[PDB]
Amino acid sequence: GSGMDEIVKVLSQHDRILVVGHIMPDGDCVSSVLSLTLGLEKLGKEVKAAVDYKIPYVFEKFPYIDKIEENPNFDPELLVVVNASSPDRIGKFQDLLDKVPSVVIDHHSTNTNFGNWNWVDPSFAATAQMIFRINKALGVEYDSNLATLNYLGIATNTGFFRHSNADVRVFEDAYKLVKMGADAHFVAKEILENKRFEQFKLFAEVLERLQLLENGKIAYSYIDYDTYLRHNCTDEDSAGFVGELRSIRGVEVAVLFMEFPRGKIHVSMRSKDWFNVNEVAFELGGGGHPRAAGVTFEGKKIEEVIPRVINHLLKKFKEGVES
Template sequence: MIDEVIKEINRADTILVAGHIMPDGDDVSSICSLVMGLEKYGKKVIGAIDDEIPGYLEELPILKEKIRDFDCVKNTPADLIIIVDASSPDRVGRIQELFEYKRIVVIDHHATNLNFGHVNWVDATSASTAQLVFKLNQKLGVKYDEELATINLLGVATDTGFFKYSNTNAQVFEDVSKLVSFGGNISYITNAILENKPIENVLLFKDVIENLKFKKDKKIAYTYVSLDMLKKYNILPKNTPPFVGDLRSLKGVEVAIVFNEHEKNVFHTSMRSKKYFDVSEVALHFGGGGHVRAAGFSKESDNIEKLMEEVTDYIAEKMEK
C-alpha cells in the first residue's frame, strides 16, 4: 500500500495531514514528521488537529509550528488529506467536514481501523504510526536531519511506553537505531516528557488514589479525575496526566482504567492491560477503539459511579469467558 500512498502524494499539489482528537505522542509525531518530510519532498503541506496539543508535549515547540487547529486550516485548499493514527472518521473531529470533495489517504496501525479512506495503509503489526511515516519518508528519499529524526523518534518512544510495552519488537529497535544515527535525540524526548512533571500533577495523583477502586480480585483497578479535582490544582483538562500507567503498574492488576472528565459530564476513558486482556474490544463496545493493550472511548454521563460500574462489570464478565 505504500506505493499507492506515494501515487496519491505525487498527484497532489497541496496536502493536509491531520490526526485524531485527544492527540498523543504518536499522533503529533506522525503529523509533524510527515509534514516535515513532505516539505522536504517539495510539497505544499500543512498539519492539523481539531484539538489542543497536550501540555506535556509543549516542551517540543516544533509541534505548534507545524500543527494548526481546525479554524486555521478549514479554508485552506488541499487536493489530498492524509489522516494519520486515526481508526475512524469521527476520531478526527471537524476535519471530517473536509472529506466530501477530497481524496483521503489513511495511514494507521490500529487493528480496529475502519479503512475509511480511498487508500488505506493500515499495518497493525507496526508498534506506532510514526514508524510507518518513517518508512514512507525513507521511500520518498527524504533526507533526515536532527530535528526531523527527533520528532519522528518521539512517536516510536511514546507508543511503546519508552520501549517497555509488549509491542516493542525487533523492528522498533531497528527503526530507533536508524533515527538515532540520523541525529534523533532520545534524551531530549525523555527529559521533556518523563523528567518534567509539575508538582500539581503529584498533588492530583493523591486525590486520584483516594478514588481508586478494585474489582475481580484486584485484577481490575479503576479511578476517575473530575473537573473539580482539576480546578483544585489549577490544571487544564488537556493537561490531565496519564495516570492509567501508574494503575497498570500495580502488582496483580491486569486492567487499569481512568475516567477523565474532559468537559462537564463528558468522560474520556483510558484503558490499559498488562498481559492477556483485550481492552480494544471493550473500547469498541463503548464506541471507541485502540489496541489490545491500550484503548479508550468517550462517553457522556452525569453519574460517574454508575459509568464506572457499567464498564468494569462488562470487563469482569469478559474475564469470566
C-alpha cells in the first residue's frame, strides 16, 4: 500500500477537500475528522467535514464540533475518508467514491483499501495518531484547540491509556499533544462523565442476564431491542458495557450481544490477558483486534446468534488453554 509520504503529497496537491468519517462516530472518528479538517484549513485549503450520522451528545462541547456536517453541499476535488474500514461505513458519502478521487487513512487492519490512495497502518492505536503525523508533515502549527481535538482519539481508542494498544508511541503522542495545549481533563470529563441515569438502569439489565462459563473465565450477557426501548436507550448508551464485564475478577473473555435496531445483533468481544477474540470474530464474519473484536448479524433472532457465537468461542477457548 501507499505510505504516509504519498498521502501527504496527494493532500498537498488538492485544495477543495471533503473529509468524511464513519457512521456511529466514536472519539477516534471525531478526532480524526476534525484534526485533519482543521490542519488542512490551516494550509489555506477549502475543506468541509462530514459524517452521515447524528453526532453523539458527548461531543457537543468540543471546539469546532459544528464543522462536522450531515449535509455538507460541497463538490470536492478530493474525498478523504478517515478511520472508516469499508465504504458501507460512510453512509451516503460512499456514492462519491465513484465520482471523486479518494484517499483512505486508517489504522484498522480490516480496511478494504477502497481509496485510490490508501495509507493503512495497524501499528497505530488510533487513526488520530496518523492524522497527527500527516499534519506535522504538511507544516501545520498546533494551537490548544487542535491539540485537544487530536488528543481525543488517542485517549478514547486506548480506553484512556488502559488497553493493550497503549504503547510507547501512544504515550509520546499524548505527551506532545498535552505539551502543545491539549486539555486532557476536558476530554475525560466530556467523554466519560456525561452518563445518563438510564444507562445505569440499562446496565442493571445486563447484570441480571449475565452468565459465566468455563470456571468463570467467560462472561456474556445481552440486551434485546425491547430492553433498549424500555429504558429510552440506543446502542450509544451501552458503549463501555462490555469492558465493564471484562473487569470482573477472573474473567478472560467478555461478550455482549446487542439487538439494535430490531433484528440487528451486534456482538462485542473483549479479552484480558491472552485470548485472541479477533480469530473468533473473523470466523463468524466480523473482525477486529486480538483483545477487542466484533461481529454483526442481520435478520436473526438473538436466540440463534447467542448459542452460535458462544459455541465458537468455547471451541477456541478450550484450544487456547491446552495450546
